[PDB]
């Protein structure tokens, strides 16, 4: 579990969104596994606006932050899970690292701010849903 809190927005994995998230929906995209809802209080996270391919992510199944090199956001085939059938997920970045079901939502960050959140795993690989192209998170 985990979310990004930027301005008056909460960014979570679409597959982990709560009823309150759906009742205060701003935007959702199943192909990216992302959902954004509105919040009453202002958040402290800042979104990175860069093309970094190195950063650090939080892994809840190890209570540890790991430095990683990750690929550029792309269209990647993801195996069937309890939340989606086997399909192509867009805006996904892969890295070598530990992940388990329960780790989705952990933040990946670079020197510029938040890059994205854990969204996929398996095989000693971890995938992150990028948020750096969502420029509207910084305003309104
Ligand atoms: C099976 C699951 C996963 O990749 N997804 C489940 C939830 C839906 C995901 C998607 N974005 O489509 C696919 C996974 C396997 N390992 C070892 N770690 C994970 C994870 F970190 F919890 F994501
Ligand atoms: Zn950066």
d(CA 90, CA 104): 16
The domain limits of the chain are 3-44, 45-140
135 to each of 111, 121, 130, how far by Cα in Å? 18, 26, 12
Residue 106 neighbours by CB distance under 10 Å: 22
DSSP string, the chain: ---EEEEEEEEEEGGG--HHHHHTEEEEEGGGTEEEEEEEEEEE--B--S---EEEEEEGGGTEEEEEE-PPSEEEEE---SSS-SEEEEEEEEEE----TT-TTPEEEETTEEEEEEEEE-SSEEEEEE-TT-GGGG--
Structure tokens at 7: 């301005």
**Which residues have C-beta atoms less than 6 Å from ligand 1?**
15, 33, 78, 81, 83-84, 89, 99-101, 103-104, 118-122
The angstrom resolution of this structure is 1.3
d(CA 80, CA 87): 7
Structure tokens at 32: 């990216």
Q: Which residues pair with 74 in a beta bridge?
A: 92
Tell me if 11 sits within 8 A of 137, measured CB to CB: yes
Cα-flanking dihedrals φ and ψ of residue 100, to 5°?
A: -145, 160
Closest by CA position to 33, among listed 121, 117, 138: 117
Tell me if 97 sits within 8 A of 55, measured CB to CB: no
Q: Which residues pair with 56 in a beta bridge?
A: 67, 109
**Sheet (strand 4-13) strand order:** 4-13, 34-44, 25-29
d(CA 139, CA 119): 25
Residue nearest to atom 3 of ligand 1 (CA): 120
Tell me if 49 sits within 8 A of 132, measured CB to CB: yes
Longest Cα separation, the chain = 40
- Taking the alpha carbons of 29, 111, 59, 42 in that order, is the dihedral positive or negative? negative
Q: Which position among 21, 59, 103, 104 bears the catalytic label? A: 104
């Amino acid at each position: 579990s985990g979310a990004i809190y930027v301005g008056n927005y909460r960014v979570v994995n679409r597959h982990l969104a709560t009823h309150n998230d759906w009742a205060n929906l701003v935007w959702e995209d199943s192909s990216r596994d992302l959902l954004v809802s509105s919040t009453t209080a202002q958040g402290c996270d800042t979104i990175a606006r860069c093309d970094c391919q190195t950063g650090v992510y939080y892994c809840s199944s190890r209570r540890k932050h790991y430095p990683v090199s990750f690929s550029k956001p792309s269209l990647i085939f993801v195996e069937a899970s309890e939340y989606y059938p086997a399909r192509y997920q867009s805006h996904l970045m892969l890295a070598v690292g530990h992940s388990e079901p329960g780790d989705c939502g952990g933040i990946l960050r670079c020197q510029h701010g938040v890059v994205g959140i854990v969204s996929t795993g398996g095989n000693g690989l971890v995938g992150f849903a990028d948020v750096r192209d969502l420029l509207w998170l910084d305003e309104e």
